[PDB]
């Protein structure tokens, strides 16, 4: 599991002012790796397929309601022509 | 005076993870040209558009009691 390395370790005694070829040490945190929990991708409760099914069912319900509105609102011209024509004839009777 | 142990930062340094037999063929790596997400997004946008349009139609068609009273009552007064 350990990444491979030709050099095990050596003894280095750094100074402050004369760090020549200023490197970038790999910093490490101080909290134990036991507190650093492993990652888990929390899967969503629903799937996009179930989303499609539910949204399509809702679209079917909305379309049924819109069709009901259409059949109730398509007769209004029929009401117009059923109500005024007898009255227009009555006015013509004068 | 600062002291620590050192390990050489070598290009030859490699890391060796291990992969299980059931790794690569996860169902989501291989996906078709058409999945349910795009249809979900488009369908939700269309649903919101229709929700706005029904309200617009409701406010555009709410004049029938006014569009009929102002056509009938003046004729009533004229005859009366």
Structural class of chain A: mainly alpha
Q: Distance between termini of chain A?
A: 107 Å
The total strand number of chain A stands at 1
Global Rg of chain A: 40 Å
Subcellular location (chain A): Virion; Host nucleus
Organism (chain A): Human herpesvirus 1 (strain 17)
Protein name (chain A): Capsid vertex component 2
Family (chain A): Belongs to the herpesviridae CVC2 protein family.
Report on this model:
Chain A has 94 residues and is mainly alpha-helical. Chain A contains two helices and one strand; from the N terminus they run βαα. The radius of gyration of chain A is 40 Å and the shape is rod-shaped. Chain B: This is Capsid vertex component 2.
Question: Quick recap of the structure?
Answer:
The first copy, chain A, has 94 residues and is mainly alpha-helical. Chain A is 47% helix and 5% strand.
How are the SSEs ordered, and which strands pair?
This is part of a larger assembly, with two copies of chain A.
Chain A: E1 10-14, H1 48-73, H2 76-93
Q: What features would you highlight for this structure?
A:
part of a larger assembly, 2 chains, 47% helix, rod-shaped
